[PDB]
Design a protein around this ligand. Structure first.
Ligand code: SF4
Ligand code: SF4
Ligand code: SF4
Ligand code: SF4
Ligand code: FES
Ligand SMILES: [K+]
Ligand SMILES: [Zn+2]
Lengths: 700, 96, 125, 115, 48, 106, 210, 87
């Protein structure tokens, strides 16, 4: 373009858009300017002064993080003047810093340590006493050792701009300036654990991870979160075959570089209540450890005796694709098609025939382009914490208009509350409601319906009513044509993949035709008890945790967890992503699909795949998008699906729309892994019982 | 603080003991399980608290360069004593 | 003086690796993700190759972490994505390639913090 | 390009010649080795093993890969003929202490997670 | 030590012990950490 | 002197050990202190180089004056935390004097 | 020579002389020399095409202004990213002129390298070491065979892709009354450390962005 | 129960490829009729870039037959779905 102007970086010409800072100009020739207060996903602060750099023929040094480049500047990032500015600034930072590196969890992965080695001096000339600061208790997750704080104010900016919480700020003045909440408060948020990562020093550290490991001894495994349908990219840190912590992994289009606190601190649930050995019912009626040979023989003995409707299966929320296809193929060879999921998605009209019906067609990255957003019967803050964070980013940087139909929940950003009754959806179609114009005049509208709403008995109507609105907008030439309006926001990590494999959403089929033999493939919801089955139903539970499904099964086949297998999951937007093995399953547990593959051979209906590649070549046949990793495809044909939607007309219930999760307390414990976690248990107690209630020693 | 498990095995200061049915406790049959008897947690409790008259106090563990790195401790809070991260000694501010 | 050889270059037979650890191993080619606990980006410059994790168990005597996998600690560094693939093929490992994720450039303005009519105004400093 | 310096063979016909020769030297040797080293195998078992080692490398078609395979096989022979090896090295080909390792899915499934 | 006695600490041993190798008082190694993964305990309740 | 262990589980000795003879695990103690739960030295891996005592910030790990501790079985040379704590209690009288004599050179 | 107690002084006359001789060798053997570089601590390296070994080594040994009579060392470096992964390094010494020079070339798994024994008899065992550890075959070598590894040892340990502890380990078996090799199993796995800092240490060696 | 009863159909087509134009045309025009015609027959349409169009049918007891739809016209496709149904 002609926008670009030319600047030099040590004599190397680079062309940059006007308004780019000096720090960004240096990044294009591959240099990283030192920093403490600058973060590319926060507002510029310019206070640490570590980024000071020299401009040739300029007497003064400029803050590289906050200085727009002007045409024809030569940035000297390695002149004597620049180096001495860095040494001076590092000296001031370390003057009052405590001698805590041996006792500080940040040791070995500290920007203050590393930048002191690279850009600071090798010795001190500070001959006075140091500052000491009392510690604040801002919750059971983040441990505060504020003597180490360097006052970069990153935490303050993150909470204000990213989490939408104004609890953190600076009280005092001068050298006594302190970071905290002033009062006794807990900075409890679904994104609270993120201030640990952005804090460059050991001032904010993870309480669950305190003291347990050092950075240099941990092996990094890149994997995917399965605690929600956003598919956040994580790093699983392991040491000597043990899961130590979970860190974020940068993905620009998904979670940027954040994760939720359930993603961050629920890994301790993998260390509790684990199913480690096959179990069968003895003659007295209790479950007893037994060998894989005895266990699979019983399951195979029953599987052959039944056919068709007799054999049914339910898929839990954390199940991987490879298991889903394996179980499906096993029940096909007995001629059963009662492949269910706990989650309910209306089958009226097209249903799962067209992917567009049950995907987030706009994509998570798309929200940054929307100009109006309608949320219906969904609390995105708790059902998809990282999606709501993307909303607030657009609400903040692009001036997005957000309207909500449902309970008046707090989204951390102000929204227009159209109301709570489902009938408001009808009005928007007619044009009576004043909001109907905003959708009409908006160039890039977006409509989000949450899968939590569709769990109502009138779910088919709501999806049709909401799809009715999206159809009106696109028909009028207001929309750009290739922009997609109708979006479904999912909350279960295995919902999209199951739907793409022809699973039948919900347990209506089972209730319609109670089965003789039932496979609970990780299903802990409680949807199907023994009240809802014949007298002697042969339940077989396959999962990694003992919680709700296991206690009622006849045979328990221990399975792996998402940290222990290379599996495929599809997130709410349709993107397929794969986990990797970080540690192997405990005890006698085995990978999920291998259990079903083995059950086949003992059954006689041997499946045609015996390795992970082969079972992933099968997924390609059933749905070719389940092996396109990190790629979002796209589902057209909204017109066709809409038409089938109106064929049968159903009545909206008069019940008001209420999301299942109304307050933070309902966010921490929502699945078997998080229910086992004890960090989540202390988080639930902290928000409910009281803030002050949880108080523990934090000497170092 | 050396208590024994119901089996008869002494528990260590880390809290480790071989459960009732673990075969690995055979390694001690005819021999002995070595357990240090001076529990660091119980010895550092006994130490008295050090009343002081300033808001900030520095601890190096004693001995100058034979102790731990020097740390400055804040004593503003009244509800609790201030503890050394390294040596565990406690301090309090006097009549204040 | 010279000859013409056209076949796909393969050396599994002469390298000396056992068959078990050529055929059943899935190499992974990727650029390491930045450690979010730090802002430095000097470890995300080169392509690494690693293999799938295998079982580790507790040594019965001292509780150490025991392995039977001879490739567990093997990591290779490459300049480009082609080199990692070129190396993996001639050694006959099944591999997966993950595309480099580059931070998206951003628009940063200090003046944006003090805005007359926009929500980007900051309530504190 | 495909223009590559040769080790010995300039095409597979020459390479297959040296392969054939090297098999002669090994086939003659096993009767001597089973005696000098006082092995407990029969000369039939020894010659089957030489057949097995040569067979595993059947697919190879690159002339250069075959030269190196022959070069290595001759070095192995030179050690056995000159008795630089010992009774332990010669018997390592037979893996007589490693217990049977299964190869069917169910067998590998019962014991461990290895694929 | 008579002229220059060693500093007295209460935790220091009073009775020196010689090499106990090969005796019933020898040192036997063992892991000093607690179990990592807890196993789910099946209910004693039998209801089917 | 009070009796609290000097080791704060920083793992600097484990990181420096040229022979990888040291294995450390840690956790917060019941009183919130940063203390190890596993400290092991494989004395058959160790090269007795003394890098670990050079790297320790709190003089917690030392190489003592004892050179007469040969054993009859290999298992007797794999030291856990209790053994090394017992050696410190056994040999503190001499170790402290040796540190007193050399700490100024260090 | 400056009053900087901790900084190694620069010898600039040595740098000039070594640069002059680098051109001299490049001018005389242009058919083979691919690069000439002198480091900051004064060490001349000549990079050559693998076919110029004997002509290049012979010229340095016998020329009346070279006289690098002594082969100080001969070794290979493995850089798997390069297409020719193996780099063969010759360190030579001249006693007449009290100078050293390094000659470097390259090869791959399936390209032979001419033996230098015709030039330096010292290279006989050096090349056996290179073959054994790196699997680089030298043509026309009087006696090429393993020199360090055990008999019947499959693999080449000094390749970057050979695992540190290898694949097989030895023990004595009572039943068969001999030392038996078996697949390696370690009671304690070697613990890999990630030590690299995420911050650049040496700007002078920064590589241009992709 | 019954035997050979069609249990499911699956149509895999690209989104922008030239040789999938017929399959796309069939979905836009005829699919709605097909779904109404067969209310309880799962017809799974799965779009993915650079696939070769195909028709997968699953019968009783997990028997699957595939039929290519590459470079087929809409009516050409309609015959294929006609052939699959009633067999
Ligand atoms: S934050 Fe912790 S690791 Fe970093 S310099 Fe301060 S005490 Fe050391
Ligand atoms: S607590 Fe951490 S992030 Fe917050 S101002 Fe202090 S150093 Fe910066
Ligand atoms: S003396 Fe032994 S334990 Fe200490 S660093 Fe050296 S090898 Fe490791
Ligand atoms: S012995 Fe010293 S260096 Fe080792 S972990 Fe303990 S305090 Fe750190
Ligand atoms: S990074 Fe520029 S002043 Fe902090
Ligand atoms: K931090
Ligand atoms: Zn202290």
């Amino acid at each position: 373009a002609s926008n670009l102007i030319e600047v030099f970086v040590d004599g190397q010409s680079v062309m940059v858009e006007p308004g780019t800072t000096v720090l960004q100009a240096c990044e294009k020739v591959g240099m990283q300017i030192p920093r403490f207060c600058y973060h590319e996903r926060l507002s510029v602060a310019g206070n640490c002064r570590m980024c000071l750099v020299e401009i040739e023929k300029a007497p003064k040094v400029v803050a590289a993080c906050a200085m727009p480049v002007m045409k024809g500047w030569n940035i000297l990032t390695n002149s004597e003047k620049t180096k001495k500015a860095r040494e001076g600034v590092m000296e001031f930072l370390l003057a009052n810093h405590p001698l805590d590196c041996p006792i500080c969890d940040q040791g070995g992965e500290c920007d203050l340590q590393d930048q002191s080695m690279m850009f600071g001096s090798d010795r001190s000339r500070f001959l006075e006493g140091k500052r000491a600061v009392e510690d604040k208790n801002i919750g059971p997750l983040v441990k505060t050792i504020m003597t180490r704080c360097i006052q970069c104010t990153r935490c303050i900016r993150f909470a204000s701009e990213i989490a939408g919480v104004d609890d953190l700020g600076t009280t005092g003045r001068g050298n006594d300036m302190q970071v905290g909440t002033y009062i006794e408060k807990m900075f409890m948020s679904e994104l609270s654990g993120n201030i640990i990562d952005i804090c460059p020093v050991g001032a904010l550290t993870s309480k669950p991870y305190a003291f347990t490991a050092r950075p240099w001894e941990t092996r990094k495994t890149e994997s995917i979160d399965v605690m929600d349908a956003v598919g956040s990219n994580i790093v699983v840190s392991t040491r000597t075959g043990e899961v130590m912590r979970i860190l974020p992994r940068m993905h620009e289009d998904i979670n940027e570089e954040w994760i939720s606190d359930k993603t961050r601190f629920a890994y301790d649930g993998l260390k509790r209540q684990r199913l480690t050995e096959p179990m069968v019912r003895n003659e007295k009626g209790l479950l007893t450890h037994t060998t894989w040979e005895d266990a699979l023989s019983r399951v195979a003995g029953m599987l052959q005796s039944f056919q068709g409707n007799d054999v049914a299966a339910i898929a839990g929320g954390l199940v991987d694709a490879e298991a889903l296809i394996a179980l499906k193929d096993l029940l096909n060879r007995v001629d059963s098609d009662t492949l269910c999921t706990e989650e309910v998605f209306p089958t009226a009209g097209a249903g799962t025939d067209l992917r567009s019906n049950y995907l987030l067609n706009t994509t998570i990255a798309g929200v940054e382009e929307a100009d109006v957003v309608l949320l219906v019967g969904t609390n995105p803050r708790f059902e998809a914490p990282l999606f709501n964070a993307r909303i607030r980013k657009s609400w903040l940087h692009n001036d997005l208009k957000v309207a909500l139909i449902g309970s008046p929940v707090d989204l951390t950003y102000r929204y227009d509350h159209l109301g709570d009754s489902p009938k408001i959806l009808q009005d928007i179609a007619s044009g009576s409601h004043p909001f109907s114009q905003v959708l009409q005049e908006a160039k890039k509208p977006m409509v989000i319906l949450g899968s939590s709403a569709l769990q109502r008995n009138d779910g088919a109507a709501i999806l049709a009513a909401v799809s009715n609105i999206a159809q009106k907008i696109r028909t009028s030439s207001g929309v750009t044509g290739d922009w997609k309006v109708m979006n479904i926001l999912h909350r279960i990590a295995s919902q999209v993949a199951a739907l793409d494999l022809g699973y039948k959403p919900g347990v209506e089929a089972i209730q319609k035709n109670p089965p003789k033999m039932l496979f609970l493939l990780g299903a802990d919801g409680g949807c199907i008890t023994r009240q809802d089955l014949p007298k002697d139903c042969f339940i077989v539970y396959q999962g990694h945790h003992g919680d709700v499904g296991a206690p009622i099964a006849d045979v328990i086949l221990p399975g792996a967890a998402y940290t222990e297998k290379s599996a495929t999951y599809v997130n709410t937007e349709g993107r397929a992503q794969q986990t990797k093995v970080a540690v192997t399953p405990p005890g006698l547990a085995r990978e999920d699909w291998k259990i079903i593959r083995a059950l086949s051979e003992i059954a006689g209906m041997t499946l045609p795949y015996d390795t992970l590649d082969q079972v992933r070549n099968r997924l390609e046949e059933v749905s070719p998008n389940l092996v396109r990793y990190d790629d979002v495809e796209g589902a057209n044909y909204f017109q066709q699906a809409s038409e089938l939607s109106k064929l049968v007309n159903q009545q909206l219930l008069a019940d008001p729309l209420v999301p299942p999760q109304l307050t933070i307390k309902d966010f921490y414990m929502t699945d078997s892994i998080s229910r086992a976690s004890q960090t989540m248990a202390k988080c639930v107690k902290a928000v409910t019982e009281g803030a002050h209630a949880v108080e523990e020693p934090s000497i170092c | 603080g050396v208590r024994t498990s119901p089996t008869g095995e002494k528990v260590t200061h880390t809290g480790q003991v071989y459960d009732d049915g673990d075969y690995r406790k055979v390694r001690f049959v005819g021999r002995q399980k070595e357990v240090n008897e001076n529990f660091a947690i119980d010895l550092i409790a006994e130490q008295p608290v050090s009343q002081v008259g300033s808001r900030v106090i520095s601890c190096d563990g004693g001995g100058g360069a034979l102790g731990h790195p020097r740390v400055y401790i804040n004593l503003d809070k009244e509800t609790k004593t201030g503890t050394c991260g390294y040596c565990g000694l406690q301090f309090r501010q006097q009549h204040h | 003086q010279l000859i013409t050889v056209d076949e796909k270059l393969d050396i599994t037979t002469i390298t000396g690796v056992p068959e078990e650890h050529i055929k059943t191993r899935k190499a992974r080619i990727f650029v390491p993700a930045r450690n979010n606990m730090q802002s430095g980006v000097n470890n995300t410059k080169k392509w690494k190759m690693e293999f799938d994790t295998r079982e580790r168990w507790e040594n019965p005597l001292m509780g150490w972490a025991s392995t039977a996998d001879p490739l567990s600690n093997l990591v290779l560094t490459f300049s480009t994505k082609e080199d990692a693939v070129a190396f993996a093929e001639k050694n006959g490992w099944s591999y997966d390639v993950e595309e480099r994720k580059v931070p998206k450039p951003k628009s940063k303005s200090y003046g944006a913090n003090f805005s007359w009519n926009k929500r980007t105004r900051v309530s504190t400093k | 390009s495909t223009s590559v310096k040769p080790i010995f063979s300039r095409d597979m016909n020459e390479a297959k010649r040296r392969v054939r020769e090297l098999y002669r030297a090994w086939y003659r040797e096993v009767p001597n080795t089973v005696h000098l080293f006082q092995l407990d195998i029969s000369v039939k078992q020894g010659r089957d093993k030489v057949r097995e080692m040569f067979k595993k490398n059947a697919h190879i078609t690159d002339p250069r890969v075959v030269d190196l395979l022959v070069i290595k096989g001759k070095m192995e022979l030179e050690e056995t003929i000159k008795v630089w090896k010992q009774r332990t090295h010669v018997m390592r080909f037979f893996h007589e202490t490693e217990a049977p390792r299964p190869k069917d899915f169910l067998s590998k499934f019962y014991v461990g997670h290895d694929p | 030590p008579t002229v220059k006695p060693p500093t007295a600490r209460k935790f220091i041993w009073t009775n020196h012990k010689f090499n106990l190798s090969g005796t019933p008082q020898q040192y036997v190694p063992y892991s000093t950490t607690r179990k990592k993964i807890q196993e789910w305990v099946p209910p004693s309740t039998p209801y089917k | 002197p009070s009796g609290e262990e000097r080791c704060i589980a920083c793992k600097l000795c484990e990181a420096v050990c040229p022979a990888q003879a040291i294995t450390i695990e840690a956790e917060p103690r019941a009183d919130g202190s940063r203390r190890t739960t596993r400290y092991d030295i494989d004395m058959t891996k160790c090269i007795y180089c003394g890098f670990c005592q050079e790297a320790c910030p709190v003089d917690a790990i030392v190489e003592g004056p004892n050179f007469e501790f040969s054993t009859e079985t290999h298992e007797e040379l794999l030291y856990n935390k209790e053994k090394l704590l017992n050696n410190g209690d056994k040999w503190e009288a001499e170790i402290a004097a040796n540190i007193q004599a050399d700490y100024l050179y260090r | 020579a400056d009053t900087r107690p901790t900084v190694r002084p620069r010898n600039d006359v040595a740098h000039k002389q070594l640069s002059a001789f680098g051109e001299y060798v490049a001018e005389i053997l242009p058919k083979y020399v691919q690069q000439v570089q002198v480091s900051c601590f004064n060490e001349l390296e000549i990079c050559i095409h693998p076919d110029g070994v004997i002509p290049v080594l012979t010229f340095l040994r016998d020329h009346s202004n070279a006289q690098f009579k002594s082969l100080a060392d001969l070794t290979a470096v493995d850089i798997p990213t390069r297409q020719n992964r193996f780099e063969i390094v010759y360190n030579l010494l001249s006693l007449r002129f009290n100078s050293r020079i390094r000659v470097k070339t390259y090869t791959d798994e399936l390209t032979p390298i001419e033996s230098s024994v015709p030039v330096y008899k010292a290279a006989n065992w050096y090349e056996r070491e290179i073959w054994d550890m790196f699997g680089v075959f030298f043509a026309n070598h009087p006696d090429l065979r393993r020199i360090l590894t055990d008999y019947g040892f499959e693999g080449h340990p000094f390749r970057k892709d050979f695992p540190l502890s290898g694949y097989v380990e030895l023990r004595y078996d009572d039943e068969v009354k001999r030392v038996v090799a078996e697949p390696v199993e370690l009671a304690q796995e070697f613990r890999k450390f990630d030590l690299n800092s995420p911050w650049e240490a040496f700007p002078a060696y920064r590589q241009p962005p992709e | 129960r019954g035997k050979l009863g069609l249990r499911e159909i699956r149509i895999h087509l690209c989104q922008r490829s030239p040789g999938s134009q017929g399959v796309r045309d069939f979905i836009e025009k005829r699919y709605v009729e097909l779904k109404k015609a067969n209310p309880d027959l799962p017809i799974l349409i799965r779009e993915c870039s650079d696939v070769q169009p195909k028709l997968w049918a699953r019968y009783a007891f997990g028997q699957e037959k595939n039929v290519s739809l590459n470079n087929f016209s809409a009516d050409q496709v309609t015959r294929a779905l006609e052939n699959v149904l009633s067999s």
